[PDB]
């Protein structure tokens, strides 16, 4: 079908191009301003950064799988499109997870959080976070590897179920119950309980990235699950490309979501313009 | 003739091929970017490849797994 080739082509072209930019705007525009220098602008920016490269690097190649319907690069390429899109997968929501943490730090104690959460301490856990990331991405895959398939466009990297399970646990899950436990103590606290009221605002834009983030990949890694326990509950290939780009269109979305909730990126937003 | 056919993390599924079906297959499916369905049972000649799919075609003995 050339009508649905074309209207893929440029429905995914203008959401990539989108994301690319909007990724690029957030992390200029908290670049741009000393006194925005805070370690939960730096985790910001990291999430903006795992955005921005996984829509660079794998929404293009997903996009033209989409579209052609098969690999037309290298199956070393194919292993390399894979790993990153896993590591991006993954690092989204560990910085996601960090910024969780961050947030209740602030919430908790709004006038000793410049002690508890210190510029060394927040570098310190990204680091260590973006290192775990790398490791619960790279090593699930090919330390547990079966042999390549012989078609050379073929894309795939794990057919044992055992891989996609334990994926979906450790890329989505544990940092899913992590993330709604700490921000149910938010809540709480918020609701129970200047500097108060500042962290409050930014603890409520966070909320909303991280609930518009929960809601679109939900779906995503909860259709994949259902299909690798009992394999006949693959409802259409419908579901499954509604999901999957409901997911990617989601790390599309997070530079919506930063003016529509927080005044100052708007500000700084109108100002890089 | 005993070909394997599903397989999940529960483990494997071996059952026997019926009369005139004697061969094992696999085939690939483009489902998605990130799950490429993997179909294998028995079958008297392995099915040519529609819709861009892929279809691996060997003998005997729960072979290529």
């Keep these: 079908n050339i009508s649905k080739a074309i209207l893929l082509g440029v429905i995914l072209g203008g959401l990539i191009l989108f994301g690319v930019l909007g990724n690029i705007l957030v992390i200029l525009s908290v670049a741009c301003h000393r006194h925005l220098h805070s370690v939960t602008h730096y985790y910001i920016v990291n999430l903006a950064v795992a955005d921005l490269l996984l829509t660079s690097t794998v929404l293009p190649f997903s996009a033209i799988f989409e579209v052609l319907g098969y690999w037309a690069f290298g199956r070393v390429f194919c292993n390399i499109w894979a790993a990153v899109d896993v590591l991006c997968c993954t690092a989204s929501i560990m910085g996601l997870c960090i910024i969780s943490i961050d947030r209740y730090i602030g919430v908790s104690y709004p006038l000793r959080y410049p002690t508890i959460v210190t510029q060394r301490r927040g570098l310190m856990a990204l680091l260590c976070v973006w290192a775990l990331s790398l490791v619960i991405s790279i090593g699930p895959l090919f330390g547990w590897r079966q042999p390549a398939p012989e078609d050379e466009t073929i894309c795939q990297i794990n057919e044992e179920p055992g891989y996609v399970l334990f994926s979906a646990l450790g890329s989505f899950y544990l940092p899913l119950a992590i993330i709604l436990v700490m921000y149910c103590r938010v809540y709480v606290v918020a609701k129970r309980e200047l500097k108060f009221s500042r962290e409050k605002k930014a603890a409520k834009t966070l909320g909303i990235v991280v609930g518009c983030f929960v809601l679109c990949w939900l779906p995503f890694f909860l259709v994949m699950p259902i299909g690798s326990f009992f394999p006949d509950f693959k409802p259409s290939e419908t579901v499954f490309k509604i999901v999957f780009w409901l997911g990617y269109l989601n790390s599309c979305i997070n530079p919506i979501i930063y003016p529509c909730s927080s005044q100052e990126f708007k500000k700084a937003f109108q100002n890089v313009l | ?65």
């Design chain 2, 1 to 65: 003739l005993t070909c394997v056919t599903k397989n999940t993390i529960f483990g494997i599924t071996t059952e026997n091929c019926p009369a005139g079906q004697n061969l094992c297959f696999k085939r690939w499916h483009y489902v998605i970017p990130r799950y490429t369905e993997i179909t294998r049972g028995c079958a008297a000649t392995c099915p040519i490849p529609e819709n861009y799919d892929s279809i691996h075609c060997c003998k005997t003995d729960k072979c290529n797994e």
